[PDB]
Amino acid sequence: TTSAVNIYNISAGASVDLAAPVTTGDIVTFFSSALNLSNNTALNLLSENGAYLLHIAFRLQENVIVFNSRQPNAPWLVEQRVSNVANQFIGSGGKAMVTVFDHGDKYQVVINEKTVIQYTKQISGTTSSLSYNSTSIFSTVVEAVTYTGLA
Amino acid sequence: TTSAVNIYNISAGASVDLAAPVTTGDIVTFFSSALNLSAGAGSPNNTALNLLSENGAYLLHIAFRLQENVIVFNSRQPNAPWLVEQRVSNVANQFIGSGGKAMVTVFDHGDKYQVVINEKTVIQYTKQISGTTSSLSYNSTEGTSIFSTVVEAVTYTGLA
Ligand SMILES: CC(=O)N[C@@H]1[C@@H](O)[C@H](O[C@@H]2O[C@H](CO)[C@H](O)[C@H](O[C@H]3O[C@H](CO)[C@H](O)[C@H](O)[C@H]3NC(C)=O)[C@H]2O[C@@H]2O[C@@H](C)[C@@H](O)[C@@H](O)[C@@H]2O)[C@@H](CO)O[C@@H]1O
Ligand SMILES: CC(=O)N[C@@H]1[C@@H](O)[C@H](O[C@@H]2O[C@H](CO)[C@H](O)[C@H](O[C@H]3O[C@H](CO)[C@H](O)[C@H](O)[C@H]3NC(C)=O)[C@H]2O[C@@H]2O[C@@H](C)[C@@H](O)[C@@H](O)[C@@H]2O)[C@@H](CO)O[C@@H]1O
């Protein structure tokens, strides 16, 4: 078994195409060197045809994290919400880590050490690009590390 | 499937006991916020990162030796001789692109440990001792380290 590590720098308002796609069994971690909780910010996993397989939106004024999916050029699907943004980052200390495990029929999302949701997929497929949309809750550049070739 | 993420801060000359053990299919990554490749006075001493079993066996010992200009990979049972070394020459070449920081990732593939420095696979190490990793340690020979004085370790477990 030969696995791979790839590292990407993603600016706010930018996208990257992955050198190795993320599929069942694989992991993506996003690292932020800041945490500004004092504004809506999103991290996205996208398929090769531009579907949003997983959209994670942090909304500080509404005080929720929204999880959703959508096909390209079509309406958003059914939202899942987790309340109280700040309580999901307890113990952070000015930095943060967001990890997504692809478990096949679900995505597991972990903020630092805490599992926040087991999201049942509304669209299936392989992740081939990542994007970061925002004055952000995270640093202007976030680093993404993928671990692929695991299964 | 419920996987887990755990984060540890390891000072030079210290060790941690893991809350979730690392076994086949799992990952450990070490992060350093410095990389000291200097040659003269202030050059680093030999520095190692270790994966240990519950009885203190060294399942994987990774020794960075700047003056000898090798990375040594080995194992050993508690209080016994070291087993057969595997060596990779030219330390600085394994960190090209780093820019003052470094990531070291170990995948446990069951029969082998795969070791990756940043994005580059440096060895597929055939295990000489098998078992579960239950603690990590960081040794700089009580002197100057090649890495930052605190190294962060992240484990990903419950994968398979
Ligand atoms: C209670 C309820 O059902 N509210 C619904 C809103 O939550 C919903 O808002 C949209 O939600 C999407 C996830 O389900 C997604 O977060 C939308 O924003 C993203 O996508 C936009 C394109 O559609 C655009 O690219 C945004 O920039 C991006 N957001 C980020 C942070 O990347 C979100 O729609 C946006 O935000 C809301 C808050 C509102 O201002 C919209 O005008 C804006 O487009 C809407 C569905 O549109 O339905 C319910 O109201
Ligand atoms: C060419 C050849 O075969 N050289 C061999 C040396 O490489 C070997 O040195 C030991 O190698 C070990 C891995 O195979 C390991 O790195 C030893 O150092 C670690 O373990 C020590 C206890 O045995 C002690 O705890 C050290 O602090 C620790 N080092 C680190 C950085 O964690 C290493 O032995 C040490 O270093 C060598 C270079 C020498 O000074 C030894 O006196 C010293 O203990 C030796 C012994 O197996 O055999 C060949 O010479």
Residue numbers in the entry:
A (entry chain B): 2 to 39, 46 to 141, 145 to 161
B (entry chain A): 2 to 161
Paper's wording?
Here, selenomethionine derivatization and mercury soaking have been investigated for SFX experiments using the high-energy XFEL at the SPring-8 Angstrom Compact Free-Electron Laser (SACLA), Hyogo, Japan. Three successful cases are reported of single-wavelength anomalous diffraction (SAD) phasing using X-rays of less than 1 Å wavelength with reasonable numbers of diffraction patterns (13 000, 60 000 and 11 000).
SeMet-labeled ACG (Agrocybe cylindracea galectin) crystals belong to the space group P65 and have two monomers in the asymmetric unit. As the lattice symmetry (6/mmm) is higher than the Laue symmetry (6/m), there was a need to resolve the indexing ambiguity. Prior to merging using partialator, the twofold indexing ambiguity (hkl and ) was resolved using ambigator in the CrystFEL suite. The localization of Se sites required 35 000 patterns. The electron-density map from 60 000 patterns was readily interpretable.
